């Protein structure tokens, strides 16, 4: 560990980063158990992102301006 890390703001940032990882661990265990199979909403979100990227690439003659 660098001596930059031993300050009070770095302690505060590590505390909130521990809080964010705890919340993310709760979300991961919450969406491992969903129906029909694990990870069913995540793949819907990736469907939506790929579809709008295909639209934005068709609008710019596949140059992505």
């Amino acid at each position: 560990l660098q001596a930059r890390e031993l300050l009070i703001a770095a302690k505060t940032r590590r505390v909130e980063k521990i809080k964010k990882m705890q919340a993310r661990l709760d979300k991961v265990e919450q969406l491992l158990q969903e129906s029909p199979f694990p990870g069913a909403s995540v793949w819907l979100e990736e469907i939506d992102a790929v579809e709008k990227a295909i639209i934005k690439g068709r609008n710019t003659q596949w140059k992505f301006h």
Partner: peptide
Amino acid sequence: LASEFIKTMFP
């Protein structure tokens, strides 16, 4: 590299 299409299709 068509960066955002490659990012979304192939995570």
